[PDB]
């Protein structure tokens, strides 16, 4: 065999908010018994050791080895563009090898957030559909939730990120809840967190019209 | 040695009747000497005809690319018979073969709605217009804008997504000039999916 090695970047709702801790991890894969257990040696725009830890290794029937060292990054740092490099060198390899994760590339243009009630045309259903159009930003790191009173909603979907014509991202969030529910002015929200927001977050909400 | 990979028709090309839907079978990684791939193809079990090779593109890293096509027939794959590829090469110590089906599934038909645009999308240069296709199964759908006569040519769709009860959902967003939109002009959203009567519906949109 021989080792792969997998970089990935933090996450958007750890990076976003001020409840997460957000971290890069490479993961070193493929790890034969003969000649185990790898250094790991990361750099931060070619920088430094630190608060590297390494998590417990995990066994696989894949008769290998799957072991995972994570630095732990600032939101600050992530969301300014620095670049993290995990190179991994283990003695089953001819040479160490290198990756080098970042945030996406490209000046942050904001979300502009539209609440769309149900069509007059599925009014006819008992359960509708509250959309919400969130277009116009970059990167396509975001995160969308729903709300209503004060409690989260629990049966909506979010479509992937999808590239526009323009260059920025948008993408839909879909709520499905009962007419009677829409229909007796229950006040639902549709919030958003992206980096170019002020304050990382915005929320509109949807009621029916009189 | 090499490795091969199936792949089902476009549902473009099983849908819209203008097409030739295709079963495409490429071997990928077959060496220098020691070539030539043969190919067996299988329709619930059956066999031979119609199995057309095409022609062999030198890829760079030292490598040929092989591709067999199966034309298959539009009720044929969409009634879920399953086509199976089977290759045998020397390289290989037994023969490699992958079988695709259409998803399994009872087909459902897709709810299409059309949402105008926000009232506060009213300011901006252009307006968005959503079109919400929910509620069909299995993906394997085609969406298109068209307006006055001839299609629209602004307009993105975003990927089905699965949704808690089993089907599928979409958007597409026409983006138009508020101007175009406000003078009473009108854009139609027209789906393709095989559980719509006549396989075509077309839902419209005007400011009303
Ligand atoms: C031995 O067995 C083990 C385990 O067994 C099996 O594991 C999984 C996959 C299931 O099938 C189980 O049923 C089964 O037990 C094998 O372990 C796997 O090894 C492969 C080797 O490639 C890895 O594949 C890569 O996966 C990444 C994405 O991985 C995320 O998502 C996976 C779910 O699919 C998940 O399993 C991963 O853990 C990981 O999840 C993330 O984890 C982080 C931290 O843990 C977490 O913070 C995240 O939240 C979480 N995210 C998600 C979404 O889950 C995939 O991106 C890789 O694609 C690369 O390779 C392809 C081939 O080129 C290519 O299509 C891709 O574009 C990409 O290629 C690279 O791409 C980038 C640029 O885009 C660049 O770096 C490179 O240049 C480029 N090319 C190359 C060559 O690198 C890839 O598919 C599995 O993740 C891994 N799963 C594990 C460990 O659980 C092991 O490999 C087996 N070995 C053998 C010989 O059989
Ligand atoms: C020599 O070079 C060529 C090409 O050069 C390089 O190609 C890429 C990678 C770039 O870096 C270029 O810049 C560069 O020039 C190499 O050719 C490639 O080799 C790999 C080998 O694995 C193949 O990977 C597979 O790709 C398919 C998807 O392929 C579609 O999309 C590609 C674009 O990314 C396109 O290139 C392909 O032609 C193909 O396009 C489709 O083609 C059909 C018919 O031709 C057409 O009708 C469609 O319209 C068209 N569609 C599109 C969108 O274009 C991918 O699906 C495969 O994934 C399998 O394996 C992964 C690893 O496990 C896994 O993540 C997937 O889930 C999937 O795995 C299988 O999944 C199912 C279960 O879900 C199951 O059947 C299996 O159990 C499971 N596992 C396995 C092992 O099958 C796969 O990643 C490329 O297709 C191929 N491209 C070619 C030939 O054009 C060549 O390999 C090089 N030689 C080397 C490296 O030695
Ligand atoms: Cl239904």
Same mark, same amino acid.
């Given at each position: 065999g021989g080792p792969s090695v997998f970089l990935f970047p933090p996450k958007p709702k750890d990076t976003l908010m001020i409840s997460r801790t957000p971290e890069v991890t490479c993961v070193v894969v =493929?790890?034969?018994?003969? =000649?185990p257990d790898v250094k790991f040696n990361w750099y931060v725009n070619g920088a430094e050791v630190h608060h590297a830890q390494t998590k417990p290794r995990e066994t696989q029937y894949n008769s290998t080895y799957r072991v995972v060292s994570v630095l732990t990054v600032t939101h600050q740092d992530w969301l300014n563009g620095k670049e993290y490099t995990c190179k991994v060198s283990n003695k089953a390899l001819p040479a160490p090898i290198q990756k080098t994760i970042s945030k996406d590339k490209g000046q942050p243009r904001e979300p502009q957030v539209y609440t769309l009630p149900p069509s007059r045309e599925e009014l006819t259903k008992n359960q509708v559909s509250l959309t919400c159009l969130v277009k116009?930003?970059?990167?396509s790191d975001i995160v969308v939730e729903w709300e209503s009173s004060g409690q989260p909603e629990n049966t909506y979907k979010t479509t992937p990120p999808v590239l526009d014509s323009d260059g920025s991202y948008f993408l839909y969030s879909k709520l499905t809840v009962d007419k009677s529910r829409w229909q007796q002015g229950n006040v639902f929200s549709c919030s958003v967190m992206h980096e170019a927001l002020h304050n990382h977050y915005t929320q509109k909400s949807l009621s029916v019209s009189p």
């Open positions: =493929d790890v034969s018994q003969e =000649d116009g930003f970059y990167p």
